[PDB]
Amino acid sequence: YTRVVWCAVGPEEQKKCQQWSQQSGQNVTCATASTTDDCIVLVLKGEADALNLDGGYIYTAGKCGLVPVLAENRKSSKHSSLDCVLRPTEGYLAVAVVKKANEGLTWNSLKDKKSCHTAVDRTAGWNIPMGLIVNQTGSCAFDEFFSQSCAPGADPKSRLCALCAGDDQGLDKCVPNSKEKYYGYTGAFRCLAEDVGDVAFVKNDTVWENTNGESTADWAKNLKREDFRLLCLDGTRKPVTEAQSCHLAVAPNHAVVSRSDRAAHVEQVLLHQQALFGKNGKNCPDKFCLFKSETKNLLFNDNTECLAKLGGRPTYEEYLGTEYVTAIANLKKCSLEACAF
Ligand SMILES: *[C@@H]1O[C@H](CO)[C@@H](O[C@@H]2O[C@H](CO)[C@@H](O[C@H]3O[C@H](CO)[C@@H](O[C@@H]4O[C@H](CO)[C@@H](O)[C@H](O)[C@@H]4O)[C@H](O)[C@@H]3O)[C@H](O)[C@H]2NC(C)=O)[C@H](O)[C@H]1NC(C)=O
Ligand SMILES: *[C@@H]1O[C@H](CO)[C@@H](O[C@@H]2O[C@H](CO)[C@@H](O[C@@H]3O[C@H](CO)[C@@H](O)[C@H](O)[C@@H]3O)[C@H](O)[C@H]2NC(C)=O)[C@H](O)[C@H]1NC(C)=O
Ligand SMILES: OC[C@H]1O[C@@H](OC[C@H]2O[C@H](OC[C@@]3(O)O[C@H](CO)[C@@H](O)[C@@H]3O)[C@H](O)[C@@H](O)[C@@H]2O)[C@H](O)[C@@H](O)[C@H]1O
Ligand SMILES: *[C@@H]1O[C@H](CO)[C@@H](O)[C@H](O)[C@H]1NC(C)=O
Ligand SMILES: [Fe+3]
Ligand SMILES: [Zn+2]
Ligand SMILES: [Zn+2]
């Protein structure tokens, strides 16, 4: 009923979910899975109700009948008067980041280099860059393009996982959850920051949130914006201040999905949960903040201002957009009446 079971990916998200559960009086409860895909499955079975997903998984989930309910909304500049929950979503910029000291490394010389991806199947870390690379190469062997990488979710024995490090014990190497050191936006960027990889496929925001004192995490403490460069599709290199003219694409924001028969109810519970634990929430920062977790982006991205209502009750195809939807279809022809489970 007004009770919602959230699906947590990995033990760290489980921990944050439990706090949220404790503070919600149990209006929100938790289920945990090792992978986002397993979480998709728990929702289909009806053992969990919702979770926040990157666009790539929204695509997987959509083919299986799950729908967009509310989307992450971060601070903008245009469309000022509108409240956050009513304001349109902008989408983030997918970028390719390199070290400035690594001269002569451009989009046109990425072959045989070392890469850092958020996870297999994600928008900025995989779908966009690999779709572009397959497109340009005219060959479905994206697994041979880079010499070594860390792409959580690929075969641990393959070169796509050679750069991944697992947890502090060396266990769970390449798993697509935060236990993997170089998982997600922050992980992929850390992979580049520590010179494990030559390039990182992350979003524009990740660079800003983890440099010039914004992080304080020990690996990011001393990172400086000028030491990084974005790779543009025209073979050029630009400062990270130029993301508007040097991105690989703009991605649809992450969004909360659920089985359609449960959407209306998940929507009403969440809107109330954010009134309590959101940005200007009754109990944040006092008791619990839904959008905080110190640069780890647990359950939701840390830069989320609020969860917004979607305009025009969009299907997953409309929400992702035709442009992005055909990009994925074309890449998956390498790896359509579907649903993977
Ligand atoms: C690439 O991604 C970066 C990071 O997301 C984008 O830069 C961000 O732009 C925001 C708006 O477009 C900036 O937020 C506004 O609101 C706050 C409050 O008014 C301003 O100051 C903040 O103060 C708090 C202190 O409590 C700090 O937490 C913030 O760091 C900031 O100092 C801010 O000046 C601005 O008016 C936001 O600050 C900014 N983020 C950072 C880390 O600088 C960037 O636009 C984007 N590029 C493109 C092309 O999209
Ligand atoms: C990989 O290559 C494929 C195939 O060339 C790319 O797909 C193509 O994408 C374009 C742009 O999305 C599609 O064109 C669009 O057509 C509509 C209809 O007129 C129009 O409104 C848009 O303005 C645009 O012109 C095109 O149909 C599609 N081609 C095929 C065969 O699917 C794909 O984008 C490439 N991958 C990446 C990541 O770019
Ligand atoms: O979530 C962010 C992404 O949304 C994707 O689909 C959802 C979103 O986008 C549509 O598109 C373009 C446009 O209307 O959005 C803004 C302001 O929101 C503009 O810049 C545009 O005019 C749709 O019409 C929206 O209602 C919806 O919220 C989309 O594929 C991505 O581009 C990105 O916006
Ligand atoms: C839990 O749900 C009830 C039913 O709407 C609501 O009245 C109450 O405020 C909620 N409590 C918390 C802590 O969210
Ligand atoms: Fe993403
Ligand atoms: Zn563009
Ligand atoms: Zn529609």
Swiss-Prot record:
Keywords in alphabetical order: Antibiotic, Antimicrobial, Disulfide bond, Glycoprotein, Hydrolase, Immunity, Ion transport, Iron, Iron transport, Metal-binding, Osteogenesis, Protease, Repeat, Secreted, Serine protease, Signal, Transport
GO cellular component: early endosome; extracellular space; plasma membrane; recycling endosome; specific granule
One Gene Ontology molecular-function label: cysteine-type endopeptidase inhibitor activity
Main location: secreted
Top-rank taxon: Eukaryota
Cysteines engaged in disulfide bonds, as pairs: C7-C39, C17-C30, C64-C339, C84-C306, C116-C191, C140-C334, C150-C164, C161-C174, C232-C246, C284-C289
Binding positions (Fe(3+) 2): D54, Y92, Y185, H254
Glycosylation sites: N27, N135, N204
Modification(s) after translation: Poly-N-acetyllactosaminic carbohydrate moiety seems to be needed for TLR4 activation.
Family as reported in the entry's similarity comment: Belongs to the transferrin family.
Function: Transferrins are iron binding transport proteins which can bind two Fe(3+) ions in association with the binding of an anion, usually bicarbonate.
Assembly, per entry: Monomer. Found in a complex with LTF, CLU, EPPIN and SEMG1. Found in a complex with MPO and LTF; interacts directly with CP, allows Fe(3+) incorporation into LTF and activation of CP ferroxidase activity.
The protein's name in its UniProt record: Lactotransferrin
Taxonomic source organism: Bos taurus (Bovine)
Full-sequence range covered: 361 to 705 of 708
